[PDB]
Design a protein around this ligand. Structure first.
Ligand code: HEM
Ligand code: HEM
Ligand SMILES: C[C@H](O)[C@H](O)[C@H]1CNc2nc(N)[nH]c(=O)c2N1
Ligand SMILES: C[C@H](O)[C@H](O)[C@H]1CNc2nc(N)[nH]c(=O)c2N1
Ligand SMILES: NC(=[NH2+])NCCC[C@H](N)C(=O)O
Ligand SMILES: NC(=[NH2+])NCCC[C@H](N)C(=O)O
Lengths: 360, 360
């Protein structure tokens, strides 16, 4: 049945793919070659073109992404040729460098070899290429990274135990029972120390965050083909860091410390200090990144841009899908157009899906 | 089939009602009397007790209400005896007085006669007993009240055309083709002029809001019986006014004027002035109402209290239902526990439902 499903997805994708590319005549011929290939080998190989667009389509269909407007500008890096851990490491190191782009982040994606007989050719363990390690006795670092950190320590890695230890790249090549790790070169990673434009004391918090959010634990499904290893990246949206990463109680939880440095009390809820702390924290984030020349975007510009997206999909005769619960910024939800409209949360392929974590 | 549905709902309700009241033995007897009554007349009459609890249960099952913790403290006022427009008017005037309670608002509900043969005995037009009128040329008042305002003007009512004109009570008695209106006595309505604790200039905005949000356009369904007229009220939650009523672009839209008086620019989104304006506006709301002795609650205390609710339903063996999209405050969603947990948005009776508006 796996040989049946693949064919079906393949039919829909190729057709839809070529129609968008304006190559409807080449659909019959290609589908025939694909049919033979699924018999001959048991699967098929996308063309640099198909795969590139397949990855862009997958972005456009990512219900939870608010930055979908730049879907067609995605820079696809095809690394389906990698055979060794050295090839993967270099590939990954390159993704970070090319994406980072000295601050002018480039929404990129490295396409690693897909699953063969349901077996993985490359298996990336990291949630994000760049991510901070988390530990416990009392909370040190990113709690969200507890599980993986221990998995890395079980393989010989050891962190200096600071709140911002950079986890190493960790993956497993087909044929190997365990994965291998590689420490990240400090010169490749851009970090941004957080400061405030009007409050000079904000630096006493000694906060900071990496510049590029490269999600590496998701499977890109493009027409029956499963690319479990396909790291992608956009640029950050202020709130992701100021509201979730740093303010969540289960994350860095700096709201109280922040409220303290802004000279406000934490006595009563009715003073809405948490809210005030959140705003000030997010002004700091947007200002820091910008001062350093690293790309970031605020939730309003992001909502504004997403609205343009909604209009362009319409103008192209494409139904729009989205997850309301994930699309509204965790800060001032009702101040954006997204809060006042409903969305169709339906799955459409190609897309990006979660997958069972190797550790844990 | 209407005589069949009624019986079925009735069975489930009585059982579930008496089990909660600890009167399981009286279920058989009551159900028999109810059966005869549905044959004899075509429907049945709840006891003061049944109806009271039925209305409290309906609150507990209101997926969108964050203040469900005080569900069992609801003050039910049974006015199923009203026969005239004078009886309704007085009933309504009383609900406002008893609910208002000089600022110490009382979560109340007036139970008006239910629908007979699907026909309404009393039909309230107002969205809320107390609500501001809205007009157009340029926006004057509450835009959300445009439709109803015109409906009132078509019946002889005329507003002074200020941003806060109090709409009259408007309803229709069975037998009458058109509804009748009654102006609200200024002494009955409590209003709260908005001011800021640290910013003395906030009063130049000349903002204000009524004290009690009495929702009057919803049908209370309790065991097959439809009470289309059953005005209910709780107390406000700061955000309802500061974030939605006053800040929504489609409502009063005062964010820019607010940002102006707090001495901040509206030049760039990256300064997050909207967010800052929202917070300051909500601090003003909570502070105003409190300074005047009128009950209100902030979104944190509200989330905190709702969490206690979640635990008590559990401790009582009752499945919890809720609408995530409506439960999270439009201000700092991710700072409350509600943002980090999912809810089962399933309909459970008794409950409150929307109904087609008479005007429009
Ligand atoms: C160009 C910049 C982009 C911006 C402003 C942006 C922003 C966002 C934000 C705000 C989220 C929510 C993340 C969270 O709450 O954890 C999100 C999720 C997501 N984005 Fe984007 N994104 C961008 C680029 C990308 C790229 C390049 C891809 C794919 C090629 C993409 C794929 C996705 C997917 C599938 C999710 C869901 C992630 C998850 O559920 O964990 N985004 N996006
Ligand atoms: C004791 C104070 C209460 C608080 C803090 C409270 C708060 C809330 C809030 C914040 C909303 C959202 C309203 C909106 O966004 O438009 C809501 C909705 C609702 N509440 Fe409550 N409430 C209270 C009392 C009540 C009472 C007394 C009842 C019924 C007896 C109730 C029934 C409902 C219903 C059905 C809705 C949905 C309204 C709609 O969808 O338009 N609430 N509640
Ligand atoms: C599942 C999780 O606890 C929560 O419900 C959601 C909702 N909204 C979100 N929205 C975004 N953008 N990102 C998130 O992590 C979440 N988490
Ligand atoms: C239907 C409406 O436009 C919007 O989607 C919702 C969502 N969340 C809400 N939440 C609350 N509490 N109240 C509301 O009016 C709404 N409106
Ligand atoms: N802008 C993006 N592409 N975001 C992807 C998710 C990043 C994730 N929220 C983080 O905080 O690291
Ligand atoms: N606390 C309540 N019971 N709210 C009911 C809804 C009130 C409505 N949101 C208003 O702004 O008038």
């Amino acid at each position: 049945s796996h040989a049946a499903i693949l064919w079906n997805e393949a039919k829909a994708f190729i057709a839809e793919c070529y129609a968008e590319l304006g190559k409807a005549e080449e659909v019959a011929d290609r589908l025939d070659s694909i049919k033979s290939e699924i018999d001959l080998t048991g699967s098929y190989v996308h063309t640099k073109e198909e795969l590139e667009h397949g990855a862009k389509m997958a972005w456009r269909n990512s219900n939870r992404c608010i930055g979908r407007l730049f879907w067609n500008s995605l820079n696809v890096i095809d690394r389906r040729d990698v055979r060794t851990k050295e090839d993967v490491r270099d590939a990954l190191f390159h993704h970070i460098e090319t994406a980072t782009n000295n601050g002018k982040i480039r929404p990129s994606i490295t396409i690693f070899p897909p699953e063969e007989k349901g077996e993985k050719q490359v298996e990336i363990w990291n949630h994000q290429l760049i991510r901070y390690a988390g530990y416990e006795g009392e909370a040190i670092g990113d709690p969200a990274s507890c599980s993986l950190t221990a998995a890395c320590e079980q393989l010989g890695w050891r962190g200096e135990r600071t709140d911002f230890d950079l986890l190493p790249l960790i993956f497993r090549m087909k044929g190997d029972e365990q994965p291998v790790w590689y420490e990240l070169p400090r010169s490749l990673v851009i970090e941004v120390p957080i400061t405030h434009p009007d409050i000079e004391a904000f630096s006493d918090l000694e906060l900071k965050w990496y510049g590029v959010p490269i999600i590496s634990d998701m499977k890109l499904e493009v027409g029956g083909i499963h690319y479990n290893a396909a790291p992608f990246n956009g640029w950050y949206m202020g709130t992701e860091i100021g509201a979730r990463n740093l303010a969540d109680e289960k994350r860095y939880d700096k709201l109280k410390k922040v409220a303290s440095v802004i000279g406000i009390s934490t006595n009563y809820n009715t003073d809405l200090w948490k809210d005030q702390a959140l705003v000030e924290l997010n002004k700091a984030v947007l200002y820091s990144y910008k001062k350093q020349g690293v790309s970031i975007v605020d939730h309003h510009t992001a909502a504004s841009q997403f609205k343009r997206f909604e209009e362009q999909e319409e103008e192209a005769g494409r139904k729009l899908t989205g997850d309301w619960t994930w699309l509204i910024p965790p800060i001032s939800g009702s101040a954006t157009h997204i809060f006042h409209r409903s969305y169709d949360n339906s799955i459409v392929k190609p897309n990006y899906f979660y997958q069972d974590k190797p550790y844990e």
